[PDB]
RNA sequence: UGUUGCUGUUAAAGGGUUCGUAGUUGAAUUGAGGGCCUCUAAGGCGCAAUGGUUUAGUCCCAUCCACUUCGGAUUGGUGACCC
RNA sequence: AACAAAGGAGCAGCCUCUGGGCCACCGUUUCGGCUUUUGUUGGUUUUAAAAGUCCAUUGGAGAUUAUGGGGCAGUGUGACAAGCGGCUGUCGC
RNA sequence: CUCAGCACGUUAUCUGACUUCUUCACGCGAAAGCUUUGAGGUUACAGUCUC
């Protein structure tokens, strides 16, 4: 049977982070590789500004507000939230 | 509710539910501190220091990887601004409106907005002279 | 159960029925508060005779919450199977 | 004198316990000719005392007390210390608590305001937990409240970290109870953010 | 905003009870809200309740057995006394038999019945049937 | 005249709007502790033991083979679980 | 619940055994005040504790690592492109 | 390529706005009507302020 105290998985996929039981973060990090060398650099999913390394004028991320649009040809590894 | 005029928004930033530092951050307190102060010498406000840090270095929060947050750092090293962030910004916007209105006295909108921004600045002022962070003779103009 | 005296003696005309779903008193006035009696069954499909009973309130057919509650009542007593 | 009793507090050097001597030696052994960053760092580290607690469970628990001063250090190398000490001292868990102190309400407004909130009863207890759970981090707590007014703390932990601390749970719980006088339970959850308890 | 914590809680309970719902969510938590619930759970009007931790402010969750009929709040927290127990108990409640007014005292948080017993009045808090 | 205990969509009655001082009202945290003995005091989603041929069960197995909606078979089986 | 304060580097006492050295103490205006005992009152002066201050190490803590962080120097390790090399954009010295 | 790692549409989810059920649930109201968008949660009469 359903419970408010312990909610169902399918229900809490949907919900906003301000509407959630815990109200946790809705973001994560990523390792973006600089293809202009090999330099592994941490980058943030909702970067909301450019990030550069000295191994790239290829950049890493675009500033765009919806979530970062990472430069093509770049290695993406997905770090966990926790 | 929005302080002055209409508005209900829920656009906000949450927190992490893990207040201890990530396993992929092996950086010490001191490195974080140094980075903050370094950036600050360009004239950057704390708001953009945190952004630079989180995006480049993967920092979860300044507060999570050091025992203190961004202003406390700055204060202790004597780099802190004497005009709080929120106050300064409003005063900039204000003056810029007053430029536009100097030229255009037919502009209805920006006039009303300036009235808002004024009284808002005054509220801030009043606050920070109860909770000392400005001199007690401070005034907008 | 019910009002008593200081002498312990019942004073009530009747003690009204329970609606198991909401634990509210079924009134005489409500005529939409139906008593559903299901006959139990054992191995070899033999009826044990009518044994179990449900009672539904007349406030559960004004928006049809009836079905919902009957399931939670049933499923708990092992009458209705869930996987 | 001894050069292995320099890991005990100066007061306790002329009068060590049975308990305190075994570990003392073990530390000193570790300090020489071993994997790095705990051949040097223990020398700065001086323990207040330690004690040995015996439950009715299979293993016993040696609990350690060292000042809050050295917490910042020991927190880093916490893992490797615990493990390499349990090897030298088998059949008993090692845990590392850093000693703290607690305060009570003075029953006055203006006094209560000016006390530390890291000294306070609750924050202390919470960190005692986090220490004895390490390696593994707390996600979320619940208090459930029953018909007697009995309040019961639950804690919940990662399924990532599950394997390690799964065995250690009864031991941890025991120690926490007898000291801070509060019961604790430990569950797990697979997707901690959305907070659904599981046996995964 | 909300100027009484209690009012925010016990208008969720009352509404939910009138719809027959068997659990309710409560947006904030306070030390006070706990004690109120505790009372009613002893006397048999609530199954259980959980307090959940977000590490900002908690979210209480309660299991209703449907045995309540109202849970009110007396907002100004007016002063009631050893004689004036009588007054309140008549005026805001449908009965003297099963009406429960809950009060604050230096001693703690308790029913009027227990308040009289220990002979201390205080400021009122809330009430339930 | 409605503090206890009033009304204001249409019946007497929400100010054309916004800013704003006196005034009124204002979120959460500090935390109210424990053990050993007796008591059939209760619950148990803990549990060693040992009980129970269907004097109670379901999965496996046996025999059929029934194209597909029969079954029974005994010690079945530290299995499952029930007093 | 209210009053008031704080507003967070706009700060902040480590305790302690013993020994030595110096040192009036209030006070600073042309001479003022001053602790007992020595029988007592009147006068000066000394020794001595006290307090301060300087050094000394005796034992113990610390709520945040001083065998530490910060900055210089020597050697080897890994490494880019021109100068050099493989024998097929890229690899190494 | 060229205001273009683009723009639109469909499936599903969410936050913010305006309103419809001419099958809006409970409830309220003298009725007309009102319904997460209240005139609802009010004689079981008390969230806050003001006209």
DSSP C41-79: E-TTS-EEEE---EE--TTSSSS--HHHHHHHHHHHTTS
SS3 (DSSP) at D76: helix
Q: Which nucleotide is nearest to E109 (CA to C1')?
A: F32
Contacts 24+ apart (CB under 8 A), B86-92: B86/B124, B87/B121, B87/B124, B87/B125, B87/B128, B90/B117, B90/B120, B90/B121, B90/B124, B91/B121, B91/B140
D71 CA – G65 C1', rounded, Å = 9
Determine contact, residues D64/D94, Cβ cutoff 8 Å: yes
Which chain F positions have some atom within 7 A of a protein CB?
Answer: 4-5, 18-21, 25-34, 57-58
Which chain G positions have some atom within 7 A of a protein CB?
Answer: 1-10, 59-67, 69-70
Pairing state between β E23-26 and E59-64: antiparallel
Determine contact, residues E112/E101, Cβ cutoff 8 Å: yes
Output the CA–CA distances (angstroms, integers) from residue D182 to D93, D150, D153, D175, E54, in the order listed: 21, 11, 8, 10, 21
Q: In terms of domains, do E3 and E57 share one?
A: yes
Please count the other Cβ atoms lying within 10 Å of the Cβ belonging to residue C32. Answer: 12
SS3 (DSSP) at C26: strand
Closest chain B CA to residue D75: B20
Of residues D145, D146, D149, nearest to E51 (C-beta): D145
The DSSP letter of residue E47 is E
Q: Do B19 and E55 touch (CB under 8 A)?
A: yes
Q: Do A25 and B58 touch (CB under 8 A)?
A: no
Return phi, psi of residue B54, to 5°: -55, -40
Calpha distance B2→D100 (Å, rounded): 44
In E, which residues are within 8 Å of D107 by CB distance? none
Alpha-helical runs (H) found in chain A:
9-14
Q: Do E56 and B19 touch (CB under 8 A)?
A: no
The answer for C 38-77 residues in CB contact with E (under 8 A) is: 59-60, 65
Determine contact, residues E124/E104, Cβ cutoff 8 Å: yes
Q: Closest approach of chain E CAs to the CA of A42, in angstroms?
A: 28
Output the CA–CA distances (angstroms, integers) from residue D28 to B2, B41, D18, D19, D61, in the order listed: 64, 47, 16, 15, 21
Please count the other Cβ atoms lying within 10 Å of the Cβ belonging to residue C67. Answer: 10
Q: Which residues lie closer than 8 Å to B125 by C-beta, 6 or more apart?
A: B87, B134, B138, B139, B140
Please count the other Cβ atoms lying within 10 Å of the Cβ belonging to residue E57. Answer: 11
Which secondary-structure segment (H or E) carries E23? Answer: strand E23-26
**CB contacts < 8 A (A, E):** 15
Determine contact, residues E55/E89, Cβ cutoff 8 Å: no
Strand G footprint, Cβ within 7 Å: B 28, 30, 72, 75-76, 130-134; D 9-11, 13, 40-41, 43-44, 48, 67-73, 76, 99-102, 109-110, 113-114, 116, 118-119, 124; E 32
Interface test with B, best of A15, A25, A26 (most B CBs within 10 A): A25
Pick the closest to residue D144 from B62, A6, E21 (CA basis). A6
Biggest alpha carbon–alpha carbon distance for chain B: 59
Q: In terms of domains, do E43 and E86 share one?
A: no
Specify burial of residue D6 (Cβ count, 10 A radius: 0-12, 13-18, 19+).
middle
Calpha distance C47→A52 (Å, rounded): 78
Calpha distance E129→E111 (Å, rounded): 12
Q: Which residues lie closer than 8 Å to B110 by C-beta, 6 or more apart?
A: B97, B100, B101, B104
- What resolution in angstroms does the PDB record give? 4.0
Alpha-helical runs (H) found in chain B:
29-40, 46-57, 62-65, 70-76, 85-103, 109-128
Out of E68, E93, E115, a domain closes at E68
Output the CA–CA distances (angstroms, integers) from residue D145 to C4, D121, D154, E47, in the order listed: 34, 20, 11, 10
Calpha distance D98→D95 (Å, rounded): 10
Which secondary-structure segment (H or E) carries E12? Answer: helix E5-18
The DSSP letter of residue D70 is G
Q: In terms of domains, do E91 and E61 share one?
A: no
Contacts 24+ apart (CB under 8 A), E34-40: E34/D145, E34/E60, E35/E108, E35/E109, E36/E6, E36/E10, E36/E102, E36/E109, E36/E125, E36/E126, E37/D145, E37/E62, E38/D145, E38/D149, E39/E100, E39/E102, E39/E109, E39/E110, E39/E111, E40/E68, E40/E71, E40/E128
Pick the closest to residue D195 from D140, D114, D126 (CA basis). D140
Calpha distance D99→D116 (Å, rounded): 16
Which secondary-structure segment (H or E) carries E103? Answer: strand E100-104
Calpha distance A50→B51 (Å, rounded): 10
Calpha distance D88→D29 (Å, rounded): 9
Q: Which residues lie closer than 8 Å to E69 by C-beta, 6 or more apart?
A: E17, E129
3-state SS, D131-150, equals HHHCCCCEEEEEEEECCCCC
- HSE at residue D134, side-chain half, CA atoms within 13 A, is 22
Calpha distance E67→E44 (Å, rounded): 8
Output the CA–CA distances (angstroms, integers) from residue C24 to B31, C34, C41, E18, E68, in the order listed: 65, 14, 29, 11, 10
SS3 (DSSP) at E113: helix
Virtual CA dihedral for D131, D132, D138, D142, nearest 10 degrees? Answer: -120
- Cis preceding linkage at B126, omega within 30: no
Q: What is the CA radius of gyration of chain B?
A: 19
What's chain C's length in residues? 83
Domain residues of chain B, as ranges?
Answer: 26-80, 81-141
Q: In terms of domains, do E84 and E63 share one?
A: no
Please count the other Cβ atoms lying within 10 Å of the Cβ belonging to residue A5. Answer: 19
Pick the closest to residue D89 from D38, D20, D31, D172 (CA basis). D20
Helical pair E5-18 and E31-42, crossing angle rounded to 10 deg: 40
Calpha distance A5→E59 (Å, rounded): 9
Output the CA–CA distances (angstroms, integers) from residue A11 to A6, D195, E50, in the order listed: 11, 12, 20
The DSSP letter of residue A9 is H
Q: Closest approach of chain B CAs to the CA of D85, in angstroms?
A: 24
The gap between the terminal CA atoms of chain D, to the nearest Å, is 53
Determine contact, residues E25/E61, Cβ cutoff 8 Å: yes
CATH code, domain carrying E87: 3.30.1490.10
> Left, alpha or beta for C45 (phi > 0: left; psi -120 to 50: alpha)?
left
Pairing state between β D151-158 and D186-189: parallel
Calpha distance C24→C21 (Å, rounded): 8
SS3 (DSSP) at B102: helix
Which secondary-structure segment (H or E) carries E91? Answer: helix E85-91
Q: Do E66 and C65 touch (CB under 8 A)?
A: no
Virtual CA dihedral for C59, C64, C70, C73, nearest 10 degrees? Answer: -60
The DSSP letter of residue B129 is T
Output the CA–CA distances (angstroms, integers) from residue C69 to A6, B5, D50, D176, E81, in the order listed: 20, 47, 58, 43, 45
SS3 (DSSP) at C10: strand
**CB contacts < 8 A (B, D):** 8
Return phi, psi of residue D51, to 5°: -140, 170
Task: State which residues form the domain around E79.
Answer: 69-129
Q: How many domains does chain C have?
A: 1
Calpha distance A60→A68 (Å, rounded): 9
Q: Identify the bridge partners of residue D97 per DSSP, sorted by sequence position.
A: D65
Chain A neighbours, 3+ Cβ pairs < 8 A: B, D, E
Task: State which residues form the domain around C16.
Answer: 1-83
Calpha distance D50→D48 (Å, rounded): 7
Calpha distance D89→C70 (Å, rounded): 60
Interface test with B, best of D137, D140, D155 (most B CBs within 10 A): D137
Biggest alpha carbon–alpha carbon distance for chain E: 44
What chain A holds in terms of domains, given with CATH numbers, is 1-82 (2.20.25.100)
Angle value at C-alpha D180, between D166 and D67, nearest 5 degrees: 90
Specify burial of residue C57 (Cβ count, 10 A radius: 0-12, 13-18, 19+).
buried
Q: In terms of domains, do E63 and E86 share one?
A: no
Out of 1.10.287.10, 1.10.1060.10, 3.90.1150.10, 3.40.50.970, the CATH code matching B81-141 is 1.10.287.10
Q: Does D106 touch chain A (CB under 8 A)?
A: no
Output the CA–CA distances (angstroms, integers) from residue D184 to D92, D141, D176, in the order listed: 21, 10, 8
Specify burial of residue E99 (Cβ count, 10 A radius: 0-12, 13-18, 19+).
middle
Q: In terms of domains, do E42 and E83 share one?
A: no
Please count the other Cβ atoms lying within 10 Å of the Cβ belonging to residue A43. Answer: 22
Q: How many domains does chain E have?
A: 2
Determine contact, residues B4/B116, Cβ cutoff 8 Å: yes
- Distance, CA of A53 to chain centre: 18
SS3 (DSSP) at E62: strand
Q: Which residues lie closer than 8 Å to C34 by C-beta, 6 or more apart?
A: C55, C56, C61
Which secondary-structure segment (H or E) carries E89? Answer: helix E85-91
Calpha distance D156→A46 (Å, rounded): 29
Calpha distance E45→E42 (Å, rounded): 8
Out of E18, E53, E68, a domain closes at E68
> Left, alpha or beta for B58 (phi > 0: left; psi -120 to 50: alpha)?
left
Calpha distance C66→B41 (Å, rounded): 69
Pick the closest to residue E54 from D132, A17, D134, A28 (CA basis). A17
Interface test with D, best of E38, E51, E53 (most D CBs within 10 A): E53
Determine contact, residues E49/D145, Cβ cutoff 8 Å: yes
Q: Do E66 and C24 touch (CB under 8 A)?
A: yes
CATH code, domain carrying C64: 3.30.1230.20
Strand H footprint, Cβ within 7 Å: A 14-16, 18-19, 62, 69-72; B 8-11; C 59, 62-63; E 1-4, 7, 11-12, 14-15, 18-19, 69-70, 72-76, 78, 91-92, 94, 129
Q: Do B17 and E56 touch (CB under 8 A)?
A: no
């Amino acid at each position: 049977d359903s419970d408010l105290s312990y909610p169902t998985v399918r229900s809490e996929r949907m919900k906003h982070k301000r509407r959630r039981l815990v109200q946790g973060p809705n973001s994560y990090f990523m390792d973006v590789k600089c293809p202009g060398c090999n330099a592994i650099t941490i980058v943030y999913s909702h970067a909301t500004s450019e990030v550069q390394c000295n191994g790239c004028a290829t950049k890493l991320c675009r500033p765009t507000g919806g979530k970062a649009m990472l430069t093509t040809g770049c290695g993406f590894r997905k770090k966990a939230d926790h | 509710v929005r302080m002055q005029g209409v508005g209900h928004g829920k656009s906000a930033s949450s927190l992490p539910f893990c207040r201890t530092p990530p396993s992929w951050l092996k950086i010490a307190s001191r490195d974080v501190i140094d980075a903050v102060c370094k950036l600050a010498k360009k004239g950057l406000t704390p708001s953009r220091i945190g952004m630079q840090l989180r995006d480049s270095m993967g920092i979860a929060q300044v507060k999570n990887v050091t025992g203190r947050k961004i202003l406390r750092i700055l204060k202790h090293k004597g780099m802190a601004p004497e005009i709080p962030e929120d106050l300064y910004c409003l005063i900039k916007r204000a003056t810029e409106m007053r430029k536009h209105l100097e030229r255009n006295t037919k502009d209805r909108d920006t006039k009303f907005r300036l009235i808002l921004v004024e009284s808002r600045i005054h509220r801030l002022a009043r606050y920070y002279k109860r909770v000392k962070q400005l001199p007690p003779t401070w005034k907008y103009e | 159960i019910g009002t008593y005296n200081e002498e312990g003696v019942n004073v009530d005309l009747y003690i009204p029925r329970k609606c198991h779903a909401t634990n509210n008193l079924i009134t005489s006035y409500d005529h939409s508060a139906v008593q559903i009696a299901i006959a139990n069954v054992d191995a070899n499909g033999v009826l044990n005779g009518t044994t179990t009973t449900f009672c539904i309130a007349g406030y559960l057919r004004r928006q049809a919450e009836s079905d919902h509650a009957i399931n939670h009542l049933a499923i708990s007593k092992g009458i209705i199977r869930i996987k | 004198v001894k050069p292995h009793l320099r890991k005990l507090r100066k007061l306790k050097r002329p009068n060590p316990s049975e308990d305190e001597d075994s570990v003392a030696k073990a530390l000193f052994e570790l300090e020489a000719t071993h994997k790095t960053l705990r051949t040097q760092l223990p020398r700065f580290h001086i323990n207040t005392v330690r004690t040995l607690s015996s439950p009715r469970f299979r293993r016993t628990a040696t609990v350690v007390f060292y000042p809050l001063r050295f917490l910042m250090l020991v927190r880093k190398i916490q893992r490797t210390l615990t493990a390499e000490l349990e090897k030298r001292f088998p059949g008993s868990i090692v845990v590392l608590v850093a000693q703290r102190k607690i305060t009570k309400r003075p029953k006055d407004v203006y006094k209560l305001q000016k006390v530390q909130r890291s000294r306070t009863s609750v924050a202390v207890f919470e960190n005692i937990l986090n220490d004895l759970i390490y390696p593994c981090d707390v996600m979320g707590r619940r208090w459930r409240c029953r018909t007697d007014g009995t309040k019961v703390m639950k804690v919940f932990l990662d399924s990532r970290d599950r394997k390690r601390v799964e065995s250690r749970l009864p031991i941890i719980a025991h120690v926490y109870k007898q000291l801070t006088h509060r019961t604790v339970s430990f569950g797990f959850m697979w997707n901690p953010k959305l907070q659904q308890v599981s046996s995964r | 905003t909300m100027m009484s914590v209690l009012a925010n809680a016990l208008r969720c309970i009352a509404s939910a009870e009138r719809r027959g719902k068997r659990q309710v969510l409560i947006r904030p938590s306070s030390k006070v809200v706990v004690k109120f619930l505790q009372v009613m759970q002893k006397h048999g009007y609530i199954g259980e309740f959980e307090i959940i931790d977000d590490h900002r402010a908690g979210k209480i969750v309660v299991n209703l057995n449907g045995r309540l009929n109202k849970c009110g709040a007396i907002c100004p927290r007016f002063d009631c006394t050893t004689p004036d127990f009588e007054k309140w108990v008549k005026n805001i409640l449908p009965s003297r038999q099963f009406g429960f007014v809950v009060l604050t005292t230096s001693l703690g948080i308790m029913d009027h019945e227990e308040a009289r017993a220990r002979n201390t009045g205080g400021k009122v808090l809330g009430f339930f049937y």
